[PDB]
Structure formats: structure tokens, C-alpha cells
Design a protein around this ligand. Sequence first.
Ligand SMILES: [Mg+2]
Ligand SMILES: [Mg+2]
Lengths: 154, 48, 41, 157, 266, 292, 48, 142, 102, 51, 58, 108, 97, 141, 165
Amino acid sequence: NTFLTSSVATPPISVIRTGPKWWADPERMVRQKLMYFTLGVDQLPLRRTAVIQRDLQRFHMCKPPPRVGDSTGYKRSRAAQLNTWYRRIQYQEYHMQHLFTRHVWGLLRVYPGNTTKIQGKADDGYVGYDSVPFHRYNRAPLPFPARELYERRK
Amino acid sequence: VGYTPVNPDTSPMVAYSQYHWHYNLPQGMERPHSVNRTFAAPFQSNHS
Amino acid sequence: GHVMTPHTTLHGRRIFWIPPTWNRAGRFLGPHVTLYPGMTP
Amino acid sequence: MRHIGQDVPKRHTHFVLESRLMYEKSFRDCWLHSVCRAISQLDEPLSKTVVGTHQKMLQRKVTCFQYNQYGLFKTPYYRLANVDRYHAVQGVAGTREWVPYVNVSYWTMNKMVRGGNLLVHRVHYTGWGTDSHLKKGGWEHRWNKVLQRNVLQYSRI
Amino acid sequence: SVSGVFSKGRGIGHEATTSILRYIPRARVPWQPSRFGRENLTAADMARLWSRGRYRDGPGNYNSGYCTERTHVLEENTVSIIPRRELEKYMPDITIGPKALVTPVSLMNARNGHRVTHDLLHSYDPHIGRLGKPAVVDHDNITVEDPNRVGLNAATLDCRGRIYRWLRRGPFFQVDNYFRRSVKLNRDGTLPTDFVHEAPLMRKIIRLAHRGHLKAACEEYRRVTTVPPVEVYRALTACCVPGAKLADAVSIFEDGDSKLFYVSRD
Amino acid sequence: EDGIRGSEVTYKIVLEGFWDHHVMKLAEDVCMFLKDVGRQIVEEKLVAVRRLLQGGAVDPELLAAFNCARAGPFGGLDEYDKEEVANFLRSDLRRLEEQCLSVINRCNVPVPGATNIYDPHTSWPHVEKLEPWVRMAEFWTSSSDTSFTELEMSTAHYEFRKFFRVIICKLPFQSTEFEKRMYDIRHWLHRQTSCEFHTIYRRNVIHDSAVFPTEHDPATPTTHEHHRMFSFALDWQSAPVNRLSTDTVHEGESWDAVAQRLGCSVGELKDANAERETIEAGVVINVPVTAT
Amino acid sequence: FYEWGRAVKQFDFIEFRRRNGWLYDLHLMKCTTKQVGPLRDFNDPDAV
Amino acid sequence: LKIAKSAFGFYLARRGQRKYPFLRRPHIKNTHSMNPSAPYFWSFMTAKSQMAFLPEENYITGDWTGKFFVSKRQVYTLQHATSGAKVRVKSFPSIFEFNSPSRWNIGKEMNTLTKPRMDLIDEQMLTKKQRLDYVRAGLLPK
Amino acid sequence: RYKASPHGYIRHFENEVRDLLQYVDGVTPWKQAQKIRTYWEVRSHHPMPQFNRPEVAMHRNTVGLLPAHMWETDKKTGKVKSVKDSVRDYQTKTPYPKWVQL
Amino acid sequence: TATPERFSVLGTTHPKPKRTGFGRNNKMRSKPSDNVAWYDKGPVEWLPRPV
Amino acid sequence: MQQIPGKVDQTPFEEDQTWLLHSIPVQQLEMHHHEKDLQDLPFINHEQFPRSLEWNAP
Amino acid sequence: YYWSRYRMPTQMPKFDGPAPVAAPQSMNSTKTNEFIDPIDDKFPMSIRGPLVRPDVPEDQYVDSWYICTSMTHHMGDYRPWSASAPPNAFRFRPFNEFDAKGREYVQY
Amino acid sequence: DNLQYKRYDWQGWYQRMLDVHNRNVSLRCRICDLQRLDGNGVQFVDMQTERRLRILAQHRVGMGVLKLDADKYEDQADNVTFGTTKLSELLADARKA
Amino acid sequence: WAKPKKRPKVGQGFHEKAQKWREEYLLDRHRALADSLRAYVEFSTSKRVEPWDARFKPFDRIEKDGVYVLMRYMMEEKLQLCNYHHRPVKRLFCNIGLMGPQITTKARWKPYRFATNPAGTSKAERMYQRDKTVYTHGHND
Amino acid sequence: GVHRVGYTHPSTLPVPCAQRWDLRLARARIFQEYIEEKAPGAWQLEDERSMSPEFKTFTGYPMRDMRPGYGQNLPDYIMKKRLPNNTHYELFARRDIPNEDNAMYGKYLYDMTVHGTSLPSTYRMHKDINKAQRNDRKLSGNRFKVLCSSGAKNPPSGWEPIPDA
RNA sequence: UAUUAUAUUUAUUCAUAUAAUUAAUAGGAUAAUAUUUGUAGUUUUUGAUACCAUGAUAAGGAUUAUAAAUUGAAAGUGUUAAUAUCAUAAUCAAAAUUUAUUAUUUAUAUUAAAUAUGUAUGUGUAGAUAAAAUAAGAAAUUA
Ligand SMILES: [Mg+2]
Ligand SMILES: [Mg+2]
């Protein structure tokens, strides 16, 4: 991993709201798929996501279907329910990506960006060479040189 | 309008007015001028 | 749009009576103008 | 003088005339100045014929001559003030407050365009224009194309 | 009740003419009958006026180095001048003198028509630098003070029409005036051709042409300030004959003829 | 070359207006003018040519010009008789008649329903378009001392424009008369319209192996050191170099010894010096220009 | 040719014409006065 | 301008905080000209080449009566220290004198020896409002 | 007066350059042009005229460059507290460069 | 020359104050913030840092 | 590129590191061009005559 | 006088009478353009069509100086599209075989 | 200029300024027409002479046309002199082949 | 656009104060300069932490193999002569050639300010514990 | 690589042939050319932007040279540089001036030829007319300010100003 | 009610001016002859100024919609034309922060040409604020 510096975390929903621009950008989604496939694990959530989003993109310039007014509000609530389903289908994916990426990085002897967990290796966030001399969230002092997660041979 | 007067060649609001030639009319020369031919001056320099 | 069509009041294809003039209109280009032309054969 | 019988409404218009004379002085001094600069700063030998102690000597002789020239106009052009020939309003060139081909300030350009005095053509305020070259690469590109037809189309001899 | 700029002034023209001339009414400019111009300033006042108007370089400005005041006040603080003898102790004197201010005629075209590197522009015509008398530039005596007041001063009284005149001048103005105010046929019908300071140069040209060095001779012909004598043209064309150079013989002849007063017609 | 693609002289008149239609209609005007004047001149030339074709003598001078060679292609001084020379002359005149006729015939194509002055096959002279000069001015419309933002938000775009048409006339010969009419069209041009005149003509240059001789590279070569900055002003003369056309005869010398020293045939050295029959010591002599 | 348009020479030529009393053709020096009215139509008096 | 510190206060507008093209601001005010660097000491705000000659302003060019201050692009030379002659420079309020000569100055331009913006402030050139605003920024005590 | 005049670029001015040189040399006494100094000749009298900037050779700086005898150090910190006066005792055989005789 | 014992006017002036805080307008406190990760919940820290 | 014979010289570097770690500087002050300086900046684009940018010298 | 030129040659039309049919006249709150024709804009685009100016090859139009509007560089004369092309030219075209680009690359 | 700078005190300097803006004189010749028998029966420019001509004048040749643009002097006359000279000097050197 | 208010007069005896303050600001600057030159040179002369980032390859490898072998036997002397300053160290690695294209491409180096720490540096805090009285631009210890 | 550039003189070859460097010196004599001795062999860099048809900005010629440090200062820059003489700067110097007609002719000349007389500027005329109007009602809000004061302070022997009320 | 959606995203440490005289014309080689080479008559006026001394163009989204079509407005933001009756204040370099009205580069490699910024590492952390539905990708609470 080349990008090492401390970062700003964005809530999952705003990441998903980027649609085609980032979250569903074809290019990105394909190399996620590559990671999964190479690990020998089906990519179902990715495929659900890709389906939902593919279709989002196809109809993205159309006006929504005409609404008739109801005291029930069954329509509004069914649209909502469907929507939060899709949101959750994608939360699951977003989680999977962060999960597997961290795990794979643990196998590749990769050091993550500052303040990032790698389950077996760095439990509290890993940090080295931050702009700030302490670990940001522990409030503990950082050693020089940067802490090493892996034994030396390569 | 001002103490500095408009100069009639560069201003389209003079040039294209009703008292002059608009840019959408046909732009040919109006009348010929023969000055030097009709009455000619003899050359006398200011310097010897 | 509808948030500006006080200020777009000249901008469609408009028959005029008196055409606007540069003293009275700062940025308007004229009624015949097409800013976003499509390609036509 | 001393505001007795002044002919022009703005006194400062005269400064514009002063400016003209500055450019005149530059035409009179540019070649000279630059030659003295180039011969002064040259580290490599000047030539086959002038080398070594002669060259060092001649260099110092020249910069001594150049320092002796009182009133020789060395001021770089971008440091001269731009001031209107009409209302004597000033603007920084390369900024939106100075208009280069008419050489008037924004204030005068506005006044002159709106009451028709300049003949220009209005183009949509937000784009690059009617012009092909500007449409391609913007200001820098058009700048380049001007260089190309002033200089590069010639194979000099 | 009366506020003047200048206390006293003087007449441009002298007793013999004026005392009689006054009986003939002269028409003054209708809208401003009285004229007090920069010819009419006294000597002192002219000096003062002429110092000012030259931005920083000019002698008027207290820090130019030409200042005659012994003291100057910056924001209530009085500063005493550092004399030049003292200034020199840490700031070496490299001063060529007035010859440094005048380039040769040879360079006049590089310089857009000038021989003079002074701070005011110097015109070679009679009128722009005219005071009461016609302007004449000394190339030996050029000073920062400029006693004859022939330079084009940007800010002085009466300057404006002079500046305007200078900006209207024709493409060869400097050059033409310089050339016609010197170099003109003598009252006897003799050619201007024989001058003491240029003689050895003409000799050298002739000499070079007789030994058949056409290029060296032509290269010296270039540096001639004054009309060259007939003998030069004779020598130069005679040199063109044996190698058959015709184009060159012809351009030589045509150069000396009807440009230079027809020295070449011989 | 034949037809449209070749000529002795080309004039391009570049007309410039402030408005496009101005320059378009000016180009029609000037174009029809040159069509008429062109036809008149070229017709005149054509009758001169037809007369020269019908018959004529040969200059002694033109014959002499064919016969100046030390050796022709067949490796000896060649004798052109007046016949042959007249035949060359005649062939060129033939070609000139074809070209004249081509110009005239295109002058007569463009009638009122049918006029197209853009294609060169259909008319003489023809017209080429030239991309317009367009400068866009960007500036503040506000006068505000207080805020930069408000100044930027008021920005206008206006353009200066200049429009151009080009008129091309290619002629098979050069006529000062045509050139004169053409320079004079600037006096009757349309209102607020100007023009340039481009000329491309053919001209004889002369390469003198005498003034610019072709010699071996010097025995010592020239370094990069003769090329410093200001080497142009210091280490070099302007070409051509001056080589002496006059030499003095040394004491023991003789015609052939002098010729040997100067690098000539003795014949040459005698021709250049024809006045002198014999050469004494200390006498001044003319060096034949071909001398090596 | 570089010098022939100077104003001094243009106005001197005018002065020469003035001493010979022929000013009729000169541009600066003539003031046209008379205007030529339009031609009426029987197709309408009304149209202004 | 709001306050006129010179004549130009009358002629010029500020135009808020307005952007100028790179390295052209109409008025050359070199606040940075004395800005300490040990490693860059000989390259910062000095001649780009050490083989350049000293400027015009280290020399007496013409016949002078005398000067009041020497220019600030003049470079401090061993003689400036040794000769014991007046060396003045125009700074604000009035003039800065080099009174106490040191060799550590040598070879740098007086631009670099004269602090343009002093940590010292006159309370008497300040309006009561301006003094308030200087207390807000934590400069003046009050 | 009627001459062919070069234009634009300075190369084309070869003639003029020669003349400007000749003239300059003729008018300008060596006695005066002596006195014009180059920055390094002047800086030779600064107490620390020569060292490497950080870009290339920085690690080649030596402790021998420091003029330690010029200043006064604090023993505990290892820091420069004061600087001795430079000018009073300063002896040099070369106020101007060796080749300058005024 | 010869660095003096006392400086009359040099240290005389009012000392610039230390900033009390950080970030925008120097007024922000140092405290735990939203951007802070939680390492106690699951394999991924939360919210997850960019990867 | 032709070079002066007898002069010790270098060839354009093939390795990225050779470029990166050499002493080549970055542009820092305002930037100059010997022809283009006369037309001041790209925004002040000085034009003596309004010739077509495509004008062709005869 | 130099000014003798700027006199009126003809008597200018008087203002005798009232505002024209469907004039803009503004009551208590009215947004009024003097510029827009009241009657000819109100008239449906379906009927009148999107045209502002006659449908004619645009070479006949000039973008006016100082007025936001186009004018005809021959006052008021109009030539129809048919007069730009050859007789009976398919989609008025210099030649019927191809469109502009088709013509270019065929030629190449 | 026929318009504005036609007739008054500025007509002179504007005229001269155009003339100096226009000093360039383009000198062309086809290399084809240089290959001809010289007065001595030897071909004036042969293959080797042409190769040498091309290498000597680098970007000054294109489409087999040698083109010199003579800008050096303010007046066109002097530029045809100059241009013509450079041409014969360049031929003189190319002919060494 | 309001007429500009006039500026109050300068001060009385402020010309003396400004003279003195600038005078001894300069005198102080002499010692600040002297001291920072001392510091700069002391830094150039003294050793630094290793410039390469060991978290990546070819540097992570056990100190008994690979690049470290290449360093211990061929480059050691030179690496010590330049005191592990990051610029000459990286250049020496380019010139040893037995790594070759990798130095810039595969290998990672510590950031500027970390690489500048004195040899022996244990805690990161050290970057901030260097002297601020001295004008070296972070080139001081 | 770091190498010594090298040159084989044709006399030494087993066929004489004209060496490209020698030709280069020929070309430098003909069009007089500065040969930069210090030009680094490694620095050949075309200007990608203008010289590659891949960028929209493609002029076909090397618009700028890509050298970071290059400045108007350097003798090399000075040697190839366009002097300001007869460029647009000169055109501005002459044609852009406060009253544009003073570019075409002397005002006095024109006025005296066209009108019989010199005419004051419009501004001056305004102040004149105004004085006449307001001197007709009030008097003595005035002042007497001249260029030269002696004419008022010692007036001629005659000159007895008409008393006013 | 039909002629159809604000609750999304991204932002916020913002500073820069100085060394007083505005008043008119005047032509040169290749022209049938002008020393007009070197054209010489001080002195009666007063406003745009540092100063009261009218006019005129900015910015500022809130309901004429989709087709062959523009998301920038008139209500006026220093410099401009009839009120005068304290004063030379104007850049041609190298210069002195208090002013509402300003998007700066945040950790592998860091000062070469006009001289060009030494300072604020602190858990992306108060209060309060900014911008956008336009070749992009946002969809349901009108008067
Ligand atoms: Mg207002
Ligand atoms: Mg002034």
C-alpha cells in the first residue's frame, strides 16, 4: 500500500450515494471482483450490488412513476421499504470490501493507511509516520522508526 | 457628452448613423474626387 | 428555468417589437441565438 | 500650472504623455543596455580573438561604461504604469481591469462599449468565444498561435 | 490681492527691433491675450523649473546626488546630506566624464535616432528644444544640468505641445535633421567635402582602394560622417574595374550622386 | 506546369473589412475588375506572341547567350546555329500561347446566372477564404473599490473582429501595367476596407564561382571556438571575401611563370591583360578572374 | 512618400487654393448646406 | 483607500482583497527581504550568481554634491564597515543608519539588513479604533 | 544617412557591435573600471564566505568552515551566546583584489 | 558589533500570545471527534478508513 | 544531437531514478521566452496588427 | 457649419394619438417588457413555429452591432434556400452524391 | 494604408512601420532547377552536391525547395541583397562535393 | 468610495526608537546567524537515522541477507562517509548499480522530516524537540 | 552513459568521407551560429504539449523550450531576443495619447487654417463662459491669479481701472 | 387534482500602495534656384485641485417548461456633461499590515536566473457560517 497517511472516514451511505462516480464505477467494481475470485470465494454481494446499480444507471434520466394520493400511504411505505432493502444490500457489500481488503493486506505484508485495523496483526489502529507524534486515538506516544507488523524476511 | 469630443471615424454610433453610411448598405465609393488634377499647386518647399 | 424566469424574460424565441439595445441590456445575445446546438445533417 | 487656466478636465491625463516618453527612452536605450548586459555577464570566452585577460578587462570596461550612462532607461515594462488616454484611470495589465488591444482601463472600456463608441461584437459572457483558437486551448493557446505566425513560419537566413 | 506664480519675467527679443515694432498692433490669441511662456522665465526660475519634472534621476529631486540643499526633512526628522568626498570612502568613484554620454554617429540607427544617452530626449531639429533661440546640441558638453535647455523636459511649463510635436515626428527626423544641420554646401559653391578631422580616413580609403582592397575600402567608407571628396569615388570605382564588378561600381557612383550633392559626377 | 497550376507571376491581394459581408462583396467587385483588366492585358500579350510565332529574326545577343559554354553536353564547345536557337525561342512562345489562352478562357466563363468565383477552374482571378482575426476582450463592468467578488461577477465578453478575403491572380508573364492597375485598386476600395499585396515573381540570380569560389577546406580546420557568442561580430568577416584582381610581376618572371603562379592558362592571362604585349619586372597586371 | 502626408503640407496646399479662390472641392474647407428632399408616392401620402 | 498614508491614498482603490497575476503586485513591498536563513544565506534575496558585478548603486556615477541616503539594493562592502562614513538607508518612519559596523553584514544587500516591518509599533500613529484592532490580534497590551 | 540598417535581433547588428566596443574601450579608463567588484571578491571578507547549500554537497561541509574564534559559546548548551567585534582588529593584505592599484 | 549586554528597545515590545487552540480560527479544542475509529467492534474499525 | 568532439558528455538517462535524484531544479520565478516576452502574458496578448492568425508570408 | 449636416431633411412623424393595440400599459403590479410584442408572442408556437426570423440560409443575416437582433445584409430582400444550391439539388447540396463529410473522404 | 493613417502627420511613421514590419523577403528555388549543366559542362548540382546542400541548410529545405527568408535589414532591397548573397555562399559550400 | 481620512502624524522620538530597535535587531541577527550556521554545519557533519523505509522491499529483508549484504560488504564505507544523509545515500545506491532500477521505483524511503532525525532517535517526538531559536529550515538538530 | 564525444578525421578512415560535425561547422559559418559549448547532452527534451498530435495544443513547433531556470537575465537569452524597436510598443507610444487629434496635426495649425484662429479647448471655454455669466451678477467672490504677477503689481503708466459699483 | 422531486453532496485560520510645476505652429536627396542656414514682439487673470462644485453602465436565483430554444434582472456599484472661489500632492521601479466582502501547497525524494515570504504538529476536533440540481449520474410533504 502506497497511501499511508491519516484519513477521513465517510459514513457508508454517503459513499454509496456516489453511484456510478465511485461506488459503482465499473473499473473499481471489477478489481474488487478480482480479489474475491482469486481468493476462491463467490462474489454474491458484489453481484447484487452490480445488478441494483446497473439498473439505477440505465433509468437515471427518467421521471419517477406518477403518484396517486392515498390515506393508507402503502405506496410510499413500499417504495421506502424497497429502498432501504437496497441500501442494506449495499452496506453488506461495502463491509465485505473493507473486510477482505484488510485481511488480504494482512497476508501480503502490506501496511495500511494510518489509524487502520488489521484483525490479526494491528488490533488498535496501525500507525507509523503521522504528522502528529502520538497515536491519534490511543493518545500513546509513537516509536521511531515506524512500528513493524511483520517478521523481517521477504 | 463630455469635455472630450467623440472622434467621428472610430465611433460606430457616428459612422453608422442616419447622417452617414450604415454597415448594411452597399459600401461602394460615393463619388470620385479629383483634387490634384483640377487645380494643382506648384512646389515650393519651406526649406531652400 | 423556473427559479429564473424573471431574469430570463428575453431568452426564448421571442418576437420583438422594440428589440433590446446595449444600453438597456447587459448580457442578452439576441433571440435567434443557439448556445447548445445539436448536429443536424 | 498651479491650477490656473487648465485645459483638460483631468490633470493627470498628462501623465499618459509622460508614459509615452518612457517607451521612447526605452527604444533609445534597449539595444545598448542589452548588449552591455550580455557582454558583461559572459563567462565563456567572448571569441577566438578576444580571450583571457583582454576579455576580463573588456567586460569590466563595458559594465563601467554602462553604469556611467545617466538616465539610460532600464526599467522593465511590466513595472511601468498603465493609464488611460481618456479618463486617466489605471489598471494592472494581465488583470481584468485593463483591456489590452484598445489599451484602456475596464472603466473606459465599459463606458465606450455601452454608449456605442468602440465597435465590438457581443458574445456570450461565459464561454471562450467565436474564435477557433481560443476555443481550443484558451488564452495560452491563442498566445502561442500569435507567436507562431509572427516568428516560426519564417525559416530565417 | 494679487497672486502670481513668478514675480518677474523678460522679453524674448531685443531693443532695436522692439522699440519700433511696437507701433504695429499684433493680434494676440483672442481667448488668452497675455502669453507668458518658458522663454520669458528669468534665469533663476528657468533653472528651478528645469530641475523639477525629471522623476528621480533629475537634479531637482533631493536624493539624485545633484541637490544643493544641505538638509532635507522626512516626516519631521531632519536629515543632513552626506557630502560626496565622504560618500566615496565606501562607494568608489567610477566616472568617465561627458564623453560617456554620447555614442558615435555609427550607432544612431541602433538607438532609434539618438547620439545622446542623457535623461531628457534630445532632438536634432531647431524647434522642440528651442528656448528663445534655435536649439542646438553640443555633443562635447552634455551635462546633467543641461544649461542650454535643449532637452525635451516632460513636466516643465509649456512642455505639452513640444511633447506632442515629438510624437508626430516623421520616420527619419532625428537622422535627417542631424544630417542637414551639418553637412551643407558652402556659400561659394564649394563642396562641404574637406574637413580636418575626417581627412586621414579619406586618405586611408583611397590608399586601400589603390592596392585593390575593395572590401576593406568599402568597410571604411561606412564610418565616414561627412561627404567624402571626389578622389575617394575615383579611387573606389577605378578599383572596381579590373574584376569587372559593375553592380558595385554603379552602387558606388549612385551613392555619391544625388544623395551626397553629386560629388560622384565627375 | 500546364493549365491552372503554373505561372510566371502570382499576386495575392488580401482584403480586410470589419464585417464579413463587406469583405465578401468587395472581393466580388475587385475580382470582376481584374477579370476585365486581366483579359485586356493578356489578350494584348497574346497578339504579340502570335506575331512572334509568325516570324522574326534572332538577336545576335541571344545567339551569343546560347553559345557561351566552354563545353556543352557533348563535351565540346557547341555551335548552335541561329535556326536551332530560333527553335528554342519558338517552343517557349508556343507554351506562352497555351497559357495566355488558358487565362483568357477562364476570364470568359463567369456569366450572371453562372458566376462562381471561388473555384479557380471557373474564374480568373479566383478567391480564397482566410480565417478571421478574432480577439476576445474580457473585463470588469463594475466600478467598485470595495469587493473583488463583485468585480469578478460582472465580467463582459466582447470581441474585436476583422474579416479577410484573398484574391489570387496567376499570370504567365510579368507586366508592369497589370501590376500598376493592381496597386492602384487601393484608391477605389470599399468603405473602411484595406488591403495587402503579396507578390511572388521569378527572378534570375547569378552564382559567381569567381566571387564565391569552391575550394578545398583549409589546411587547418576551424574549431567550435570560432563560434562563441559575439564570434559573429569579432572572429568573422561578412561573405564574400575580397580576392585581389591585381598582381605585381616579380623580377625573374615570365608570362607562363606568372600564369603558373596565379593558376591560369597563359591564354587567359594574356586576354585579361590584352593591352600589354610583354611584361617587365615591377609592372601591375590584371588577374583573370577564374584563376585558382 | 514617407513625408507627403504631413499636415503642414496638406494645409499649405489648402492655403494655396484659398489665395487662388478655389475652395470648392477641398474636404476640410467646404461646408455643404443644401439637402435634397425625398420623392413622393401616389401609392401613399400617409407613409412618412 | 480608507486612510491616506501618502498622496496615493486619494487616487487608488483597494478592490477588497484582490488577486494579481503571479509575482506582479503593483507595489513592491518586500516584507520578506530580511528573513533569516543559515543554509541559504548567500542565495536568498541576493544575486543569482556570485560572478555578477555589484549593482549600479555601489558606485558614484556622476559629479555629485552628495546624497541623503544610499539605495537599499546597495551591497554592504568591507569599506562600509572600515571607512567609518555615514551609511544611511531610507526606511520608515525616516532613515536607518548603519552605525555599528560588522563584518557579518558584508556581501549582502541592505534590503536584508533592515527589518521592513518592526515588532515595534507607535501608538501615536494609530487611531483609537486601530489600536483596538491591534489589541484584538494580541500585539499591543491592553 | 541612407544606410542599410539592421533590425530586430542583436546578431544582425554585427557592425554596430564592433563600433560600440571600439568606442567603449576608447572612452573608458582602466583606472576607473578597476574599481568595479564582483560579489565573490566582496564576500571574501565575510567571516563565512564558503559552504555548501543543502541540495547537492551538504554532507561535504566541514567543521573547519566555521569561524569559531569569532564568537562566544555556552559550555552547557553548546550554543553561540555572543559575537566578538569583527572590525577593530581586522587585518588584511587585500582590501581590494591583489591586481587593483588605485 | 560585539553583542551588547542589554538590549534597550529589542525585548521591550509586547510578546505575541501562544494560540489556545487549533484548526479553524485557532479556536478548536483537542477532544475526541467523530472521525475517531472504534477498534472494539468487529474486524473492521468503524467507521472504516479509506482503503 | 551533435556535440563538440572531445568534450566529456552524458546521454539522456534511461532509468527513472537517474532523472529524479540528479540536481535538475524546478521552475520558481516567473517564466520567460525570448520571442513571446514582447506579447506580455498570455492574457495580455499584444498584437501590433490584426492579421489573421493563419496569415501566410508570401 | 460642420454641424449643418446633422439637420433633419424631412419632417418627423408627430405623436398625434393613443397607445397602439394591446400596448404594455401597467396597472398596480405588472411585469412589463416594452420589448416583447404582446400579441405575437402570446400566439402559440404550435401555430406560428419556433422561427424568430424568416427561414433562409444564414449568410443573409448579420448579428447587429448594439442591438440584440439580426438584420439582413441586403435590406429586406430575401432569397429562398433553393437559390443557394444547383437546380433541384437533393437536400440543398452542392452535389447530391454525399453529405459534406462524405464529400471530404471520397475526395481524399 | 488607405484608411485612417493615410493622410496626416502620422501617415509617415505608420507607413515606415508597415514597411519595416514587412522587410522579410522570401527567396526560393527548386533543387531540380539547380541540376543543369554548368558553363564548364559539369553538372552544377549532382547527387552528392544535393546531399551536402540539404545537410547544410537544414530546416531551410522542404518539399525539395530551398527557401531563405531574409529579414536582416529594414528595407526589402537590402534583404534581396543579403538573401542572394547567403544563397550563393551556401551553393559555394555545397558545391565542394 | 469615501474620501480617505488623513493619517495622524508620526510620533515624537519615534525616529530614535525605530533607529535603535532596527540597530539592535540587526546586532541580534548577527548572533542568530552565527548560531544557525554553527547548527547547520554541525548537522551536516553529524550522523542520521537510516533513510530507507524498512516496511517495504528490498529493505524489510533480514539484516543478514539481500540489500543488507550488498551494503555491509560493498557500500559500508561510503554510506558512513556521507553520514546517512538521505540525498547522498540514495545517490550512492543508484551508483552501486547492483540494485539498479529499483531505488526510485520499488523501494520506499522515509519522508523528509523523519529522515532528518539524528542517529539514535527512539521516539517520534524528536522531530519537535529540535531547537527553534535557529534558522536552518529544519536542517538543524 | 558518460563518454568522450569523438571525431574521426577523414584522412584516417579506410574511405574518406565528410564527417557530420565538420558539416556542422560549415553550417555554423554560413548562418552565423552560436555553438553552446556547455549544452548538456542529456537534456534533449521535446516540448510534448505542442509537438505531439495527441494534445489539442499542437502547433507542430517547439513553442517553449523546457528549461526550468531560463531567464531574461542570461546572455544567451539576450542574444536571441526580439528588440522592442518598431514593435507594437512603438505603435502605442505614438498613437495612444490624450487628445487623439494631436496625433494627426498641430492643433494651432489646424485651427488657424480651418477657423481663422486658435480655439480654446472645450473645458476652458466652459470655465470662460461661466465666468462671464457669474461676473454679471455677483462680483467679488473672485481672486486674481496670474502666471506673472508684475503686470498687475506695477501696471503701465496709463491704466486707470474703471471704478466699480 | 391533472402540465411530476430541496433534505443530498462538498466546504470555512485570508494579509499587502509611493520621493509636487498639465498652456504654440514650424515641411530637407533623385522638385526650374526663398540662408524662410538659425521663422526670437515678457508681464490682466481666477474651478475638477489635497477642496464644496447635479446627471450616466454594478451587484443582487423565487413560477411564460421543452421544442427546431440561454440558469443572470433597470431602479445603480470611485473615476463621465452648466453650483466653483484654502492649498502643485500621481507610479518611470526595489517602498510602512486593521482592511467586512478572501477557496493555499498537510509527510517516499523540497531555493538555478528580475528578489520573491520563519511559520500555527496537536483526536478532520467550539459557536457560527459557504456553495451546487446546466456532460453528467441526487427523486416525492405548492401558492
Ligand atoms: Mg452613481
Ligand atoms: Mg507630475
